[PDB]
Amino acid sequence: GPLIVPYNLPLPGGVVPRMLITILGTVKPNANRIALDFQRGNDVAFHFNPRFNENNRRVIVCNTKLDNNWGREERQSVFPFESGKPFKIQVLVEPDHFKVAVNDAHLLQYNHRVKKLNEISKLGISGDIDLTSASYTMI
Ligand SMILES: CO[C@@H]1O[C@H](CO)[C@H](O)[C@H](OCc2cn([C@@H]3O[C@H](CO)[C@H](O)[C@H](O)[C@H]3O)nn2)[C@H]1O
Numbered sequence: 001g002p003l004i005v006p007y008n009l010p011l012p013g014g015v016v017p018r019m020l021i022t023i024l025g026t027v028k029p030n031a032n033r034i035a036l037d038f039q040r041g042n043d044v045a046f047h048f049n050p051r052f053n054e055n056n057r058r059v060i061v062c063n064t065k066l067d068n069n070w071g072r073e074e075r076q077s078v079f080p081f082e083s084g085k086p087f088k089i090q091v092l093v094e095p096d097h098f099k100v101a102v103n104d105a106h107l108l109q110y111n112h113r114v115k116k117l118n119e120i121s122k123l124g125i126s127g128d129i130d131l132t133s134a135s136y137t138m139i
């Protein structure tokens, strides 16, 4: 049975290198967006935002939100998600960046702008997905 979206996954004591977060789900048909939000309190340390129809293009927007202001976006035109299809997102925390693979293929990395990794204590998962699983493990 699917989890309820938007879904909140506590990250006890924040994130740390060698921490692997795995999100399993299926994209809804005619999906418009997906969002992962690694949060430090109200701040979003790492925002991972696949957009299925931005001016008829598919793009993943990544960014950080500090004191309610979004920063400079990082955009990646490789777009492995497809409406209707099951996906696996793996977010591996490394010393200098978040490393994201989708369906076992490296997708992008996002350098740490928020430095207090052990305060990034919650992951919000939202958008047009049926969420199957969300978990973490130390590798
Ligand atoms: C290609 O240009 C863009 O096209 C967009 C529509 O597809 C919008 O018009 C953008 O400007 C408005 C905007 C800003 N944002 C926020 O960006 C955050 C990450 O930086 C987060 O994703 C945040 O949720 C989200 O609302 N969303 N829309 C515009 O810059």
Ligand SMILES: [Cl-]
Pocket: 052, 081, 082, 083
């Ligand atoms: Cl699609």
Ligand SMILES: [Cl-]
Pocket: 113, 114, 115, 116
């Ligand atoms: Cl910080």
